[PDB]
Amino acid sequence: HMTYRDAATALEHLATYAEKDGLSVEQLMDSKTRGGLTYNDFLVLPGKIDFPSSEVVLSSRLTKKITLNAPFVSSPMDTVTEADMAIHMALLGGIGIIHHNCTAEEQAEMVRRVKKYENGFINAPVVVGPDATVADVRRMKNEFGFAGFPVTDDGKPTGKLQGIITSRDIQFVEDETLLVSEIMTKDVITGKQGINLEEANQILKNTKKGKLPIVDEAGCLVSMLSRTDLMKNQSYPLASKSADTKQLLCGAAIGTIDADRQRLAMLVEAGLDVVVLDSSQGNSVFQINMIKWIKETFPDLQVIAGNVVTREQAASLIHAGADGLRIGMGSVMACGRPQGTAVYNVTQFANQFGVPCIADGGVQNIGHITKAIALGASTVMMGGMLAGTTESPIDKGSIKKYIPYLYNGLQHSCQDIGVRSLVEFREKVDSGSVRFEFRTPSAQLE
Amino acid sequence: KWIKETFPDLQVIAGNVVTREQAASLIHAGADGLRIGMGSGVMACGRPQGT
Amino acid sequence: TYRDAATALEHLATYAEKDGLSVEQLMDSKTRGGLTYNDFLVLPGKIDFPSSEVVLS
Amino acid sequence: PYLYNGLQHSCQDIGVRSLVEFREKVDSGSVRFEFRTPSAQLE
Amino acid sequence: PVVVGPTVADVRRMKNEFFAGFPVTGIITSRDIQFVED
Ligand SMILES: Nc1ncnc2c1ncn2[C@@H]1O[C@H](COP(=O)(O)OP(=O)(O)OP(=O)(O)O)[C@@H](O)[C@H]1O
Ligand SMILES: Nc1ncnc2c1ncn2[C@@H]1O[C@H](COP(=O)(O)OP(=O)(O)OP(=O)(O)O)[C@@H](O)[C@H]1O
Ligand SMILES: Nc1ncnc2c1ncn2[C@@H]1O[C@H](COP(=O)(O)OP(=O)(O)OP(=O)(O)O)[C@@H](O)[C@H]1O
Ligand SMILES: Nc1ncnc2c1ncn2[C@@H]1O[C@H](COP(=O)(O)OP(=O)(O)OP(=O)(O)O)[C@@H](O)[C@H]1O
Ligand SMILES: [Mg+2]
């Protein structure tokens, strides 16, 4: 009996409403009405799905000149990012920022291993000298779990290669005091530095040998291939690499004190790609001077300044020449800002100048990542949620599984919202197509 | 659309939706009812159920 | 097309207000009265001096 | 002294050289504030 | 004196259960099956 509208007019009828359902980003982030928000205070509303999640592209600008295939950045914490974390973050499409709670020499070495790392090779081989006993070798086999040790004249990883000693050589040996030199293979098949993974593998098939030490023109060991390792066949088609040298990208943090000017020189000399100026209140004369000295002194270095939480801070450090900004303060404290409000107001100002911003702090799951980007962040930094992983200095497993899980999770969230890439996500938020809803305390518990 | 053409005596409830635009889309497609709710069963995408 | 970084400071004048709330806007009984210290934060400004120079008279 | 030094640093972060200056800048609108939602406090 | 007569994947499973030095009933050991693709 009662009269309803014809279903065929349903789409036409959406035009009778003054606004799309939900709030635009500007309406959500109103300081007067709704105050400082964090990620947990709101949601992104779903849109229309007309594509699979596998098609979503997550390219993200880290700096004006550096672009990553994933918006993930590991934090410069001594519990999070050292050389091992930076290598795998780069391999999986992001980047690591090595901490500076160490000597300048130690930091430069860690940067060096990242820049020199070659996938598929044992880049830091365990070695033994010739004057050691079989008993010494066997002890190493139990502690490390592998026995394939090349022997160098000085017993150091970079010494001149004399031979190779493996488990097969020492399994049945009597008289444990005998030296490695007596038992070892003197004539070692090797490969020249610069051989590629395919070329090295074929040599192992031809020679049916377990290991292939790699030596330089002076005969010093550089790396080694394990036949077992290639059999896993791990590939990294999203690896983050420098444009010029095609080496893995590497980042590093420093302070603004005078001693850190020499610290950074050592990092640049190790091949550092991007430096993060590490400070809780970055809008200072000390950091501004530091930015200007870097841009004139190291012409090929990208600089991320911070931390900032306000538009005024952002404008100051952009004027000084920053290549990116790091957003966050305290996400009890007197000075700071709720992270969501911070990201929105900085990035709304900074994105007009093309300065990408890292959202640093308060990220614990895929939901925080999506919301951080939704409010204007180009990349997101991760600390606690990466601590405890295998590649960190709890028991969360390897980031080789975790980062793809987060990568896949961010693809699905983009699909639900209805955007095919982070570039499109940014445009749709800023045009008002993507909609948001503020959450009451009860809703969060729901 | 395939259901409404293939099974003439079958009623279809589509979902889940939480927004007007979602609802308008699935009604235009021919839904006989809608199922409302997203994230009430932390997550990035959803809406408080009452709203 | 992005804005020139050299204009960043000049561009702050295009906004009607500074980022954040003034104290008068924060302490509005009608909008959100009844605040304690834990209900707000002070936003940071610009550092151009060491902390040892601050006078607490 | 710990509290004395702590108040100096917080004044530095805000950008004021003295408590007299702190008062003047607040009352002129130069010092800015942000209201915290309950979720922000737990953060 | 365990032994196994005439595939390579079945020999990798028998090593886990037990030792891969099993004569064909004439010998196959771990070294032979370590890096076999098929
Ligand atoms: N010299 C080395 N330095 C570091 N890692 C090594 C070294 N030799 C082997 N490995 C690692 O040990 C693991 C096994 O490789 P491999 O199986 O080739 O060692 P093995 O010495 O061959 O052990 P087995 O006694 O089982 O023959 C791989 O992950 C490989 O990277
Ligand atoms: N790259 C190499 N060039 C020349 N000889 C090698 C090389 N690598 C290992 N050898 C020697 O050749 C023999 C086999 O090397 P392998 O490393 O294959 O033994 P294992 O790997 O120790 O035992 P398994 O092969 O059972 O894991 C050993 O005597 C070893 O010393
Ligand atoms: N190059 C410099 N020359 C002089 N003083 C400096 C320099 N760099 C930093 N400072 C001062 O040293 C103190 C710490 O600077 P930092 O960059 O460490 O800020 P923070 O990280 O906020 O310190 P905390 O972590 O204790 O808060 C600040 O008071 C800052 O003004
Ligand atoms: N065919 C077998 N039948 C019974 N026990 C065996 C057999 N092969 C190996 N073992 C057990 O392993 C011990 C040593 O054998 P060995 O270790 O010499 O062969 P492997 O175990 O095959 O060596 P790898 O496992 O290192 O290739 C024997 O003393 C016995 O306990
Ligand atoms: Mg081996």
Author numbering:
A (entry chain C): 0 to 330, 339 to 400, 455 to 507
B (entry chain B): 291 to 331, 339 to 348
C (entry chain D): 2 to 58
D (entry chain D): 465 to 507
E (entry chain H): 124 to 129, 132 to 143, 145 to 151, 162 to 174
Can you quote the paper on this entry?
Inosine-5′-monophosphate dehydrogenase (IMPDH; EC 1.1.1.205) catalyzes the oxidative reaction of IMP to xanthosine 5′-monophosphate (XMP), the rate-limiting step in the de novo synthesis of guanine nucleotides. Most IMPDHs are homotetramers in solution with each monomer composed of a catalytic and a regulatory domain. Adenine and guanine nucleotides compete for the canonical binding sites of the Bateman domain, inducing different IMPDH conformations with significantly different catalytic activity. The comparison of both structures allowed us to decipher the molecular details of a novel regulatory mechanism mediated by Bateman domains that respond differently to adenine or guanine nucleotides. These nucleotides control a conformational switch that allosterically regulates the catalytic activity of IMPDH.
To elucidate the details of the differences between ATP and GTP-induced octamers, we solved the structure of AgIMPDH co-crystallized with ATP at 2.4 Å resolution. The crystal belonged to the space group P21 and contains a complete octamer in the asymmetric unit. The Bateman domains were clearly visible for all eight monomers, and each of them contained two ATP molecules, as well as a Mg+2 ion, bound to the nucleotide canonical binding sites. In the AgIMPDH-ATP complex, both ATP1 and ATP2 adopted an extended conformation that coordinates a Mg+2 ion between their β- and γ-phosphate groups. The hydroxyl groups of the ribose moiety tightly interacted with the side chains of the fully-conserved Asp168 and Asp228, which constitute an archetypal sequence signature of CBS motifs. There was no clear electron density for a significant part of the finger domains, suggesting that they are mobile within these octamers. Unexpectedly, a third ATP molecule was bound in the catalytic domain, in the adenosine sub-site of the NAD+ pocket, within the active site. As expected from our SAXS results, the conformation of the ATP-induced octamers significantly differed from the GDP-induced one; the later were compacted along the four-fold symmetry axis and forced the finger domains of the upper and lower tetramer to interact. In contrast, the former were stretched out along the four-fold symmetry axis, allowing the fingers to move freely in the bulk solvent. In contrast, ATP2 did not interact with either the catalytic domain or the linker regions.
